[PDB]
Structures are given as C-alpha cells and as structure tokens.
Amino acid sequence: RKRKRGVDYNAEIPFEKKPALGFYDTSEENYQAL
Amino acid sequence: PAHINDFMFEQQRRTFATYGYALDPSLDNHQVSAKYIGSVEEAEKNQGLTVFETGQKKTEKRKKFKENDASNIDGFLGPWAKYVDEKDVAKPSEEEQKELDEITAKRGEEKTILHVKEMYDYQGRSYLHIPQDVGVNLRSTMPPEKCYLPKKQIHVWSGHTKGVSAVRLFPLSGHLLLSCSMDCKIKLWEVYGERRCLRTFIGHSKAVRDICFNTAGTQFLSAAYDRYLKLWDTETGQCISRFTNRKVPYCVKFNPDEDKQNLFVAGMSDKKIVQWDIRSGEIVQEYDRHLGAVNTIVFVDENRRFVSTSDDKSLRVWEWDIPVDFKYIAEPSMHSMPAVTLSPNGKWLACQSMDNQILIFGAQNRFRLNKKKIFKGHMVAGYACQVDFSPDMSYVISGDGNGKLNIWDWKTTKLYSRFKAHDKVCIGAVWHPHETSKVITCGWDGLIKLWD
Amino acid sequence: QLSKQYSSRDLPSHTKIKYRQTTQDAPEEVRNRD
Amino acid sequence: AKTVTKQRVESHFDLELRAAVMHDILDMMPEGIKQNKARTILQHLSEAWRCWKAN
Amino acid sequence: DEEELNDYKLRKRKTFEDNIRKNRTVISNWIKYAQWEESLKEIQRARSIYERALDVDYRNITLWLKYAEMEMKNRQVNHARNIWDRAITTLPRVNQFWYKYTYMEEMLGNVAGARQVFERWMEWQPEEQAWHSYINFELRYKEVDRARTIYERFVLVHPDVKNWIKYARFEEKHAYFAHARKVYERAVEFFGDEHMDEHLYVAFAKFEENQKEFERVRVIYKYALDRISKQELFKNYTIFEKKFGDRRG
Amino acid sequence: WEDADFPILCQTCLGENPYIRMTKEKYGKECKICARPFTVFRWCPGVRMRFKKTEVCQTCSKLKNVCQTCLLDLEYGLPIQVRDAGLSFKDDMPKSDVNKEYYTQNMEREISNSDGTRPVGMLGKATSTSDMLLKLARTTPYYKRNRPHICSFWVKGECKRGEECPYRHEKPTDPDDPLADQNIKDRYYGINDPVADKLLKRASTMPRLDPPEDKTITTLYVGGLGDTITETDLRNHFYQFGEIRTITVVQRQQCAFIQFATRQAAEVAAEKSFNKLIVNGRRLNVKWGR
Amino acid sequence: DAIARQGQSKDKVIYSKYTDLVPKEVMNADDPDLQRPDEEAIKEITEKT
Amino acid sequence: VIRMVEMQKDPMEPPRFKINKKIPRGPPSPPAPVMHSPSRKMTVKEQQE
RNA sequence: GUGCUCGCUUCGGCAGCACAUAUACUAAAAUUGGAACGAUACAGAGAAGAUUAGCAUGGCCCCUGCGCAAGGAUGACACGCAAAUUCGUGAAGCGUU
Numbered sequence A: 001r002k003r004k005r006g007v008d009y010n011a012e013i014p015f016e017k018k019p020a021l022g023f024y025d026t027s028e029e030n031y032q033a034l
Numbered sequence B: 001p002a003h004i005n006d007f008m009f010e011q012q013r014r015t016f017a018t019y020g021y022a023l024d025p026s027l028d029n030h031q032v033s034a035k036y037i038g039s040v041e042e043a044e045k046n047q048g049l050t051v052f053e054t055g056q057k058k059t060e061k062r063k064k065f066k067e068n069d070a071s072n073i074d075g076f077l078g079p080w081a082k083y084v085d086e087k088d089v090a091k092p093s094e095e096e097q098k099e100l101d102e103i104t105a106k107r108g109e110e111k112t113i114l115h116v117k118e119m120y121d122y123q124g125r126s127y128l129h130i131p132q133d134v135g136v137n138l139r140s141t142m143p144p145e146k147c148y149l150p151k152k153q154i155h156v157w158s159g160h161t162k163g164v165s166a167v168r169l170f171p172l173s174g175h176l177l178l179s180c181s182m183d184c185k186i187k188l189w190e191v192y193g194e195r196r197c198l199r200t201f202i203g204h205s206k207a208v209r210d211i212c213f214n215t216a217g218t219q220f221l222s223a224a225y226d227r228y229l230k231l232w233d234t235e236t237g238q239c240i241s242r243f244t245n246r247k248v249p250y251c252v253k254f255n256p257d258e259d260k261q262n263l264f265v266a267g268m269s270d271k272k273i274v275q276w277d278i279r280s281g282e283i284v285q286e287y288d289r290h291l292g293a294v295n296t297i298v299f300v301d302e303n304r305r306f307v308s309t310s311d312d313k314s315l316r317v318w319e320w321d322i323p324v325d326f327k328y329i330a331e332p333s334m335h336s337m338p339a340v341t342l343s344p345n346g347k348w349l350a351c352q353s354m355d356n357q358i359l360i361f362g363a364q365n366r367f368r369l370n371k372k373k374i375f376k377g378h379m380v381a382g383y384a385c386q387v388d389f390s391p392d393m394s395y396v397i398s399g400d401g402n403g404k405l406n407i408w409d410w411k412t413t414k415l416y417s418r419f420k421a422h423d424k425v426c427i428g429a430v431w432h433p434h435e436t437s438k439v440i441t442c443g444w445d446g447l448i449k450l451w452d
Numbered sequence C: 001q002l003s004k005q006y007s008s009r010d011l012p013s014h015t016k017i018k019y020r021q022t023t024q025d026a027p028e029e030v031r032n033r034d
Numbered sequence D: 001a002k003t004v005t006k007q008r009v010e011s012h013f014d015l016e017l018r019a020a021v022m023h024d025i026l027d028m029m030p031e032g033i034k035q036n037k038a039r040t041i042l043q044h045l046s047e048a049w050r051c052w053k054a055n
Numbered sequence E: 001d002e003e004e005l006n007d008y009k010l011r012k013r014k015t016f017e018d019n020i021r022k023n024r025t026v027i028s029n030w031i032k033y034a035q036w037e038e039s040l041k042e043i044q045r046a047r048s049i050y051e052r053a054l055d056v057d058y059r060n061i062t063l064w065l066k067y068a069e070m071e072m073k074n075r076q077v078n079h080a081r082n083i084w085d086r087a088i089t090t091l092p093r094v095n096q097f098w099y100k101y102t103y104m105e106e107m108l109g110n111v112a113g114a115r116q117v118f119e120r121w122m123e124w125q126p127e128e129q130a131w132h133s134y135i136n137f138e139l140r141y142k143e144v145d146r147a148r149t150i151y152e153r154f155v156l157v158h159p160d161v162k163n164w165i166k167y168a169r170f171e172e173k174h175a176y177f178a179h180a181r182k183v184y185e186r187a188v189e190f191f192g193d194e195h196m197d198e199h200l201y202v203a204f205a206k207f208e209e210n211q212k213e214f215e216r217v218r219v220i221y222k223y224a225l226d227r228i229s230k231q232e233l234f235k236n237y238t239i240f241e242k243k244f245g246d247r248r249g
Numbered sequence F: 001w002e003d004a005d006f007p008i009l010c011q012t013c014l015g016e017n018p019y020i021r022m023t024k025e026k027y028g029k030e031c032k033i034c035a036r037p038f039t040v041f042r043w044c045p046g047v048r049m050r051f052k053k054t055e056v057c058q059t060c061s062k063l064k065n066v067c068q069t070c071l072l073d074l075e076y077g078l079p080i081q082v083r084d085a086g087l088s089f090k091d092d093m094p095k096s097d098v099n100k101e102y103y104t105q106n107m108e109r110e111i112s113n114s115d116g117t118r119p120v121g122m123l124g125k126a127t128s129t130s131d132m133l134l135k136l137a138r139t140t141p142y143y144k145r146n147r148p149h150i151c152s153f154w155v156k157g158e159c160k161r162g163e164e165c166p167y168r169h170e171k172p173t174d175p176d177d178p179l180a181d182q183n184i185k186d187r188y189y190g191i192n193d194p195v196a197d198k199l200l201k202r203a204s205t206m207p208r209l210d211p212p213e214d215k216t217i218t219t220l221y222v223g224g225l226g227d228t229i230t231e232t233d234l235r236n237h238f239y240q241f242g243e244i245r246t247i248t249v250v251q252r253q254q255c256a257f258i259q260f261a262t263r264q265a266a267e268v269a270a271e272k273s274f275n276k277l278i279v280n281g282r283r284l285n286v287k288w289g290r
Numbered sequence G: 001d002a003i004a005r006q007g008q009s010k011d012k013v014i015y016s017k018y019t020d021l022v023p024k025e026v027m028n029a030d031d032p033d034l035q036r037p038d039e040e041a042i043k044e045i046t047e048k049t
Numbered sequence H: 001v002i003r004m005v006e007m008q009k010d011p012m013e014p015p016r017f018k019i020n021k022k023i024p025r026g027p028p029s030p031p032a033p034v035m036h037s038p039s040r041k042m043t044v045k046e047q048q049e
Numbered sequence I: 001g002u003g004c005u006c007g008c009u010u011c012g013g014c015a016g017c018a019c020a021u022a023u024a025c026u027a028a029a030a031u032u033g034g035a036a037c038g039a040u041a042c043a044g045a046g047a048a049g050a051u052u053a054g055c056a057u058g059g060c061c062c063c064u065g066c067g068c069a070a071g072g073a074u075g076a077c078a079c080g081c082a083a084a085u086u087c088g089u090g091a092a093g094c095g096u097u
Ligand SMILES: [Mg+2]
Pocket: I048
C-alpha cells in the first residue's frame, strides 16, 4: 500500500455533502437494497 | 481576564504544594469565608502556616554531608553536597531485572500453563497414560477395519490466538495432539474425551513453526522462527535441552529408534540438515548438499533413511547420519513439494507438490513416481497443505487454502467429498490411524477441528 | 498558515505617500474651483 | 501567479483574445439557446486569421 | 461478488472522479457518475453527488430535474418535496419545476398541498397556460367556487377580453348563466370605451341568442357599436354576417 | 493554525491546586486530528506528577466534545465510542487523507461561525444523557493519570539517578492486556477501543430491571419500602408516568405492587426506577409481580 | 424566507419576494429615501475603516 | 485562577510544519435566488436565424 | 548555610532575628511508524508520412532554483467526444374537433 486517493471511493463518500432538509419528514424514510 | 497580584499567589502555591492545604480562592458573588481547602485538618492542626512563613518544625532534616574545604583535590561537594542518607547506586530489584530480560525476550521466555486443574489423573497418572476407557484400543497395531469420509464437525479447540502451523499426534495413541500457533503457543489438546486444551507451551520469540513428538511420547522437539528450537518434556513442559545453530529451521523430525531417539534431525534454511543429539546438544553431523530452504525431512526404511524435500525441487533419500544424498530427484516439471507423508503401509511417500496436486512415489522401490497415483484438484502453490492417509490405505485426506477439506478415495485417484474445512489456510488435515472417521484439521484459522 | 518565504521585490520601498500639496491641486482647491 | 515575460507574450495575447471573444458575443449576444457553439465560432476566428494572413 | 465486482466498481468510480476532476464544469460526467451510482443502488453516494454538482452549477435545470427524478423513482417522497421546494425557491421563473412538483403532489393525493403550491406559484403571476392548468386541476374536482375564484384572479391580473370570455365560457358550460351575465357586464364596463372592441360583444350577443332575447340582442348589438369606437372594415363585414345571424336566428 | 483562550480537559487532567501553572507556545505542534499546527498549553498536573500538554486542536475538540488532554467526554467521561452509543450517536467523520483534509477544512470553516460555547452539530441533539452514561460515569478524580511511565532503566535495574527515576519504578504491565495498546488516533475515532469494549461489557452486566413473560402480568412488586412511604407517594412515583390501576403497599413485608393501565408506562416507570427510584431515600426494587 | 436564508444569519438580505421585483416609483429629488449619509457618519466610518 | 506564560521561541529554529497542502475549494454559499424576468422561448425560425 | 543577638552563654549546643525562595518537552530510554530516484527488473518518448523547435491552458501532480526569472522530454498527465442531433419512442400537461 501507498494509495493516497485510491480508497476514497470504495471506503467513504469521497467529498460529502449531506442533502439539506426542508419542511418534511426525512428521518424514518429509508431505502431497500440490491 | 481577572487581575491579581502574584507574590500572594506564589505564597498560596508554596502552601498548597508543601503543606497540602490551600486558602480557597473561589471569588463567588456568594460571600464565602476564608477556608482551608485540600488537607483541611492538616491546615487546622498546623495553624495554617505557609511553606514560606517561618514556623517551628522538628521534622528530621534529611541526613546530609558537609565537605566545605575547596583546598581538597577531590573534596568539594560544597553547594552540591549529597544527602548522606541516600543510596549509592539506584538498582531496581533483581526480580524485575530478570523479568525485564525475559520480557525483552518476549518481544524467548519458556512459559507453560497447564489448563488441567489436576495435571495427573485419578491414579496420580499423567495423561501420557493411554486410556482404557477408550471404546477401541488406542494402543493397537492394525489398520482400521474401514475408514471413510467425514460428514459432521465433532469438536473445535479455541485457545490459539492466530494461525496454527502444526498439529503433532502423540505417537501410537492419538490421545494427545500438540497444536502450534503463530501466537507462539504449542498447546496440547487431549484429542479424545472433552477435546479441551491440556497444556500450553511457549518460549519462542516468534511464530510456532513445528513440533515433533518423540518415539517415547514424553518428549517433543519444537523448531521456531527466531533461529532456536526447544527439546521439551511433556509433563513438566519445559525444554531440557536447547537446539541452536543460529540458523532458520523450517521443520524438525525426531528419529524413532529407541537407541537413537535422542538423535533429532532439524532442517535449516542454509542448505543444511542438522543431525544433533539432545543429550550432548551440539551438531553431530551435517547434511549440507541442499540448495536453500529445506521444507521438511521424514523417516523411511525403518527410519534409518531420511527423505527430504526442498523448494529447490531437490528431493532426497539418504540414510540417517549418513551424510551423502545417495538418492536425488529434481525433474524439469516437478514443482515445489511442501509436505510429504508416508502411507501407513510404508510403501509410498505421498508428497503434496505445490503444483496444486499430490504425487505418490514408491518409497521402498527406486524413487519411482506413480503417475497412476496423482491426486488432482487442490491449490497448494504458496501453501503447505498437510495431507494424510487413513489406516486402510483406501482413503486420503487433503487440504486446500480455499477452505476445502477434500476426502479422496486414494485408489480411484478422485475425491468423494469437498467441504468447508477452515476459513484461513487449511494447513493440517490429518487422518487418524486408530479412528475411522476422524479427520483433525489445524490451519491459519486458529480453530482446531475434528470431523467425523 | 503564513509562510516564511519571501521576495526581493517585497522588500520595503517607497514607504511614504506623497500627498498632493497646496499648489499642485489639493482637494481643497477642487472644493472651491469654478 | 507568474508574470508575462517575453516568451509568453504571444501565447498570452491569444489567451486573452480568445477569452475576450468568448465573453464578448458567444455569451452576450447569443439567442442560440441550445449550447451556443462557442467552440465553433472560435474555429471561425482562427480560420479568419489564417485567411487574412494568406490574403 | 467479493472482489472482481468490487474492483470493477473501484475502477469506474476512479474514472468518473478523474473526469470530473479535469472539468468539474460541463455536467454530463456528473450525471453519468450519479446515474451509474443509482443503478448500483447507493443513493447516499448519489445524493452527495448531486449536491456537489448542484454546488458547482446551481442554475442547471437538468441537474435539478434528474436529482428529483432519482428521489421520486425511489420514493423518499419527503426528500423529494424538500428538493422541489428548494428548486422552486432558487429558480422560480422556471415552470417545469412547478409542474413536476404539482403532478407528483397529485398522484400523492395531498391536493391541499397542491392548492397552496399553486397559490405560491401564482404569487409570481406566471402565465396563461399555468392558470389554465390550475383550473383544469380544480375541475378535476367539483370546486367550481374555486374555479371562479381563480378566473377572478387570472382575468384581473391579466386584462384580456378573451380571458373574460373563457370565464363566461366556464359559466355557460357548468351552467351559471346569471354569473355569465355579471361577467359580461363587468368585462365590458372595464374594457369600455377606448380599446374595447368587437369580439367580447359578439360573444355577448351570441349568449343572449342562446337566450333567444332578440330585442335586447338588437339593442346590445347596436348600442355597443354606437357607444364605443365603431367600424374595422373587415370586422365590419363580420358585423354584417353576425347581424344576419342575430336577426334571423 | 488555531488560537486559544485556554485548554479543554476534565478535572482529572485539569488539576487540584487552586493556582494552576501552564505555559503557552503559539503554533506549537500538530493536532493528530486536524493534522495542522495548534497552540500548545502545558499544565503542571500535580506534585511530582507529569506535566501535561494540550494534545488536540480546539476545533478537533469542539467536533466531538471531548477532552483535549484527557481524551474522554467532558459531560460523562467515558470512552467516546461509549458516550456516542449511549446517545445512540452515529458520526460521519471521514478518514482517508484527502477526504480528511477536505473535511477538516470545511469543518473549521463551519465552526468559525460559532460562538465558542458548545460543540457543533448532533452534539446537542444527542444531549439526552442516558442514565446508562450517568451510571458508567466515574465519580471521583482518578488522579493516577499523572503518574509517570515505567522507568525502563528501573525495570531492568538501571535507573541510577536515585529516587529521580523519571518514571514510576514499578512492575511493568504485561502488554497481553487489551487495556495496554490503544492507538491515540483510534481512541479518538472510536475505532476498536478495548477499554470501550470493557465499558460495554460492564454496562451490559450492570444490574437492570428484568422483563416478565405474559403481557397480563401488569402487577409490579417494589421491594424494600419502609414505613415512611404513602400510597399517594408510590403513586407520584408511578402516576403521570402513565396510568396506574391499583397499588398494594405491603407493610407486613415492606414492599409495593403497582397494577398498571399501560404496560409501556409500567415499563418506563419501573425500568427507570430500578434500584434508583430514590424518593425520601429508600432503595426500592422495581419488578413485575406474580 | 426560512428555506431561502437556510443556515444563515439575520444579516443576509435574501430577495425572493415579488414585492422586490415590482418597480417602486419615486418622484422626489427631495425625499429622505434619496439622501446619502451626512459626512459626520462618513468621517466616523472613515476612522474605523 | 491561572497563570499563563508565553514559552520562548528559539530564534535559530526553522519552520516546523509542511504548509503547502492542496485540497479542492470548500463548498460556496447558499445560492441566491434567480429573480429573473419571464424568459421567452424563441421561434424555430429565429433559432435557425 | 552566613552573620548578629550585650540570648542562654560556654567557647558545646540550644535558640531568636535577619538573609537566602520554586528547576525542568523530567528520560541515559523504550517505543513506534515512512521514505533512499539505489539496486532489481519492467517499462519506454507531443502534433502531421519521416526527423524535429517550442510557448501556453486545467490541477487532490510535482522536482532544481533566492526567485514573481529560467529549467526539468514542449517537465508529466490531460484522450470518448459528447453531443446534440438528426428522425422517429413514449409519458405528462393545456386547448379544438
Ligand atoms: Mg509525427
């Protein structure tokens, strides 16, 4: 190993912005898989 | 950003330091009183005197010297004058010194934990006493009536902290099984009954590479990674002798001859096989016509001959303590052989060749490679899969690093079973000679299985 | 995170501002003029 | 932030000429709503220059 | 699916990252990265992706669109509504935003919400076709009180005679003829003298022809002609044809 | 780099004497979290007790709300893995080099818009400090922290400086203990802290009230009442916590029994009350009756 | 206006109302609306700046 | 009540830390609202012009 | 510890006064982790047929240089090219018959 941006992809959402929330019920919302 | 003066803070700090109690400093808008905080009753009984303000103390002033003549050539301790009640050399206890040398080894200290509450059984007898509560004689000579393939797990030994590198069957009984783990532990499990770990041996500075049980079964010669091996007993568990040529041994085999059972042959990576007597302790003979890493050497023809393998593809049959490799084999196509096991008939050396398959040779006849006995289907390149033979010469057991326990019908050259043995490299797949279904597996997985 | 590198051109130079004097054209006379 | 010295004088003149073009019309007198083909008006501009030079 | 697949993912991800690293302008790479993600079904990834792309260019209708399309196809319906309102907050004068917001709200059933978002929308006095779809929405329901409230607001933000006309159109069809009369009165007295002209009046005469009141049809006809700017010439021939009509029928 | 007013650490790390002495160096060293230069304030912990120093960026601190020297939370004081889970907290802090640097940069930008009073983000919307955290919280200042290391000389014998061995000349811990090698970065990231797993085992084995089998056992026996209690006081213990159906205050055995009107209300009152429902000082035992 | 000013201080002016789009009318060159700060405030802000 | 003292900086001490670290630029601001006039789509004729 | 008490008061001490006032990345360590442009080997050089000069643009690439100068194969990498767009697919929505 020496891979300085290689694992930014399989590991984490590389540079993350959380979708801003507005006026609605977002917590209990969630999604099914593949 | 309060503003205070300092000389009084320094007097307060001197007090709070050397008398242990302090004038409480809280400047609360709730008007508290001047109170001694810290060692309250100390300040109370001492009348509050600060470390700076003069007050009477009959405390014994520590015993000091006084040589104040600067005319002395070797004299003036002067302002630096030692306190006379002080020691000369601050040496910490011999106990912690010996323990510190041992720990500097630990990062090898011969260290043994018997997990059995009573080390000897209900007769005062060490578990080196072969059972009579066995349902079949674990001291018999004959092959099993019919050994077959396994279909269910029996017992799993947990108690090794990493990948295991060997499991040694106690000779002729299979009542004890030493399990060597990368965590440097050689832990003997009672192979029957409770299946629980019996003994825990340690003493290496690195991985536990191999152990070989003595033809008396009371001894075992254990080679490791840090250039030294231990000739250890079982019940005391410690090494009676130390083997060391300062070389990297890979495997070791104990000669079964009762008048030569002190003769241990330990392969070294430097072209070498050492023939050394435990009793004397030095190398008695050399076998230095290998090319490099000698992976393993085994007994043949009443154990007076030694078979050897190399990663240099040099395979050898040369007599015990006769240092001339008088039977040499290195084909163009034959690849590295990690492991070689003699069929319990003594007719064949079945060596797992690292070409992902196992090759059988006639060990009694002219170094003949039987291509009608070529076991297919493993992946052994890079792994030393320990493959074995059941007692009836009908069944062979084989490991793969892919989690595959293969149970083959060694006659039909084909496997009848292929199942999950381990998760990590399935190293030792040993068929029990006195049990019909028993396939005991060690591996890099740290769990030690019996299947039946 | 202020570096210690430096430059020949950033040496101090021209450290006084010439202010526009009385006779040249000070903002005062500009306040007046027709 | 390197200066413009003597070897980047022509290169720099063209950086800035073709920047100015791209500001100038192909994004401030469009109404070619789609995607204003600025990459192709710049190709005209370079062929207009070659044709001026060759008469 | 342990590592052959996973490393195929690693590759395609690193590619898309390098393409958007090079440009990070024109968006096709942003989209294709994100839709590849959605097809692999990691909507948290795809979500952050659309937020970053929206950062670099928050004036992209297609970006907003396909962002919310992901949210709707995956029915994080709350998330989707947040998306839509943020959109219509930052790019109000885009219409398809408002549209898709409503349509999704409708098949959601929260028609109270749809009404209020249309109130929002009309605060901008958007557009004729916008009003008209508002009204078709309201008359997917009974709500004729609503419909005439909206024709009220629409014709009175937009001084059009034919807007007047469509108001009375709906009055005639949904059978409120007295209201049609009031609206013809209101219309002609607002438009009135100067720039009021033929066609509102021909519609009035025709509705009263439906009423078969011939003498007042005559009086409204000639009285409007005479009171307001009269005629021009081709329209006067049209007045002659309509005159034969009104006299005969 | 950052600029500070003073450190952030617990009382244990903070000290005992009323007048504390700490020296400041601006841009002294690198926060192993923010990775960049920080200020370093160095505090004299105790008499012959190891001088400590500030060991994380103040923003790297306000991030998770822990001790910039003691490393444990500032409200409770348990491993950050623990405290987070005791709030059921789930932080998305990025890990890789470029990802972490970008995260730290925008983090400092977002924290610049703060007023310096309390940690940022979910650190407030998780402020329901559960009695689990309250109970795992240490009580007194475990001031063994400011004792020095194992004077490797004094472990082999060598520490010939007299009593001035720079380190506690005791028996060195067998590093076979999981409580030995916890990489500071991992302890900060909440990454496999064996001491935290020990706190998990402890707060899992620590006594809590047990659930019964059948739903129709809505009678709850509270053992150890005493004769300073009232039926209305047992009520006011378990009354607005739901509805109670009845209560038997057994004075011939010093206990109680609340028959409830809501099962989950009974659960709330009793499970929260296990051995700690201390009204007028008597250790009652909340269970479901026979 | 909250969704607009989302995560922003009460300093930000965020025009999103139509009543900002609508053309105001002014006809007085002598209104308060059309008058700059007087030079006292100006010299104060000069000194602070 | 606490005494802060400023620890000496050694004069002959080189810089201590690798300053030149590159990362992308942080996310901008809360986007403004586009307060535009009603925009007109062009005829296909115009478009071909 | 240094002096002086008209201190006991002998030239022993005891005492009082004064004076003198807070060091220090505590460690000789023990750790723990990455590079050496070095070998090893693979590799293996812009545009148009060949042979070649360059100067730039972009950026989570740097190196040598005091350098905002200059050089490092034009220093390297930039490579699908999307793109709409030409005909049709469909869905949504408004209006006429
Ligand atoms: Mg060429």
